[PDB]
């Protein structure tokens, strides 16, 4: 009949747009938001323990490079150590190569540290772009220092344009994950986290599951935006002129079903995805992290290759908002899984032609 | 605190002498052993990560050198160039470094 296939397709369209270009009301949006929240939350809990700086080209090349966090700031030195008597060492982490389950690169860090900057920076600033929209530009900032030649410590904050669209996003929380995950830096050991009383061990070996947790997040968010995209050039037009046989033809009508089937299926996969984030999320936030990545106070943690603005900072645990995201995920997720029947409808009745 | 002992101290050319490593901490990130006085990368004969127990050599290495995860280091065909003082820098790991020197000297 005429406003049957009629009222299907205003169905699927405000359901997809809802979908595609919502944001609180989302769960492709809020479940991309939290695999880029998770990562944030990741690095914050167990980043000022991973241990960088090893030598890339020789043991000669003694570099250092201090990377800033800023506010209760707080600065990590890749490449030095602190000697019995407590001052400083330019010879420390420098003096070992650096390669997977020993220690990260300088250069390696600062990629870490970049994305992350870029993505902490860009969150806060615009948000997340919604996943239709093609994103919002906005200039980053990356403090970082390097010590002169005998003499003083140079300060240095590089500019970066970049934007808050998702897959930009995605690639830096991608970047940060996935260094972990191939190159397994030691961490350091000695108000200690639980999971660091992981003092001689690498932190795959401390944080395997949660990295391929937040590893299958960000593979699966940049699979909703795939199809978020697909979903938005597969949009069923409204029949006009009811019994315009000449105009509504039979081919054309046949085409618009599957344009709908197509359109129908893109929002399934979406949603199948979006619990699969969440499900990917409970096994990242449920091991050594449990009781860290969810949460946000001004704890006093220190290790040797840290130094503080104040008594305070706030490693050791998330300070991402992931349990807000989370929550806002399945309140977003519970409307699509009532409407699940209306798109049901207009499934069977697409497949009728 | 850390302790080199050059076993043996007089060394004849063409034999062998292990530099042995007293009160070793039993948490270490890693360590490196150098020619000379000093913590010099330039004179670096070695370096050893207990993550992947890599003996990468340095500018240093003469290729007679065998190193272990005692922190000991045995150099073979010892010739009248392998004079003087030797330095052990090791890393625990909580980052912190302790440094022992040790020498021999060959006839």
Redesign the interface.
């Known amino acids: 009949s005429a406003q049957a296939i009629n009222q299907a397709v205003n169905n699927l369209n405000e359901r997809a747009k809802t979908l595609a270009g919502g944001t609180t009301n989302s769960p492709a949006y809020q479940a991309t938001l939290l695999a880029l929240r998770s990562v944030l939350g990741l690095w914050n809990s167990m980043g000022y323990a991973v ?1 960088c700086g090893g ?1 890339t080209k ?5 570099n250092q490079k201090n990377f800033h966090y800023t506010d209760n700031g707080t600065t990590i030195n890749c490449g030095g ?4 008597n407590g001052t400083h ?1 330019s ?7 650096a ?5 990260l690169s300088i250069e390696q860090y600062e990629k870490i540290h970049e994305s992350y900057q870029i993505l902490s920076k860009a969150l806060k600033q615009a948000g997340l772009a919604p996943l239709n929209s093609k994103g919002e530009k906005l200039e980053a900032h990356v403090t970082t220092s390097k010590y002169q030649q005998d003499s003083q410590t140079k300060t240095t904050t590089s500019v970066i344009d970049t934007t808050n669209d998702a897959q930009n996003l995605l690639t830096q929380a991608q970047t940060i994950v996935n260094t972990l995950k191939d190159y397994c830096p ?1 961490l ?3 108000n200690t986290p639980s999971w660091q009383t992981g ?2 061990k ?1 932190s795959c070996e401390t944080f395997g599951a949660e990295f391929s947790a937040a590893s299958d997040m960000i593979n699966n968010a940049q699979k909703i935006v795939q199809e978020t995209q697909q979903l938005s050039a597969n949009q069923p037009k409204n029949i006009t002129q009811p019994h315009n046989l000449n105009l509504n033809t039979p081919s054309s009508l046949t085409a618009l079903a599957q344009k709908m089937l197509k359109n129908a299926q893109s929002q399934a996969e979406i949603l199948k995805l979006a619990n699969q984030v969440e499900s990917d999320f409970n096994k990242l936030s449920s091991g050594h992290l449990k009781d860290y990545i969810g949460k946000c106070d001004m704890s006093a943690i220190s ?3 840290m130094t503080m603005q104040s008594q305070k900072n706030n490693w050791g645990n998330g300070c991402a908002g992931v349990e807000e995201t989370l929550t806002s995920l399945k309140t977003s997720a519970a409307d699509f899984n009532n409407q699940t029947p209306q798109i049901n409808q207009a499934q069977n009745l697409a497949n009728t032609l | 605190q850390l302790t080199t002992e050059s076993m043996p101290f007089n060394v004849a050319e063409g034999k062998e002498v292990l530099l042995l490593v007293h009160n070793l901490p039993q ?4 360590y ?1 052993w150098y020619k000379g006085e000093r ?1 010099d ?2 004179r ?1 004969i070695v ?6 127990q ?1 003996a ?1 050599p ?2 240093a290495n003469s290729g007679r050198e065998t190193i272990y995860p005692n922190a000991s280091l045995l150099i073979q065909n010892v010739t009248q160039n392998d004079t003087g003082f030797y330095t052990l ?1 090791v ?8 440094e022992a020197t040790g020498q021999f000297h060959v006839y």
């Not at chain 1, 390669?99 to 220690?103: E, F, G, H, I, W």
């Not at chain 2, 370096?47 to 992947?52: P, S």
Request: charged letters at 15%; proline letters at 3%.
């Open positions: 241990i030598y020789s043991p000669g090349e003694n150590s602190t000697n019995s060492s010879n420390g982490t420098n003096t070992l190569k390669d997977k389950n020993v220690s030691m350091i050991a000695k003092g001689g690498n290790s040797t290759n | 948490q270490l990130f890693g490196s913590v990368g330039n670096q370096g050893y990560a207990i993550g992947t890599q990468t340095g500018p820098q890393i625990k790991s909580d980052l912190v470094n302790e």
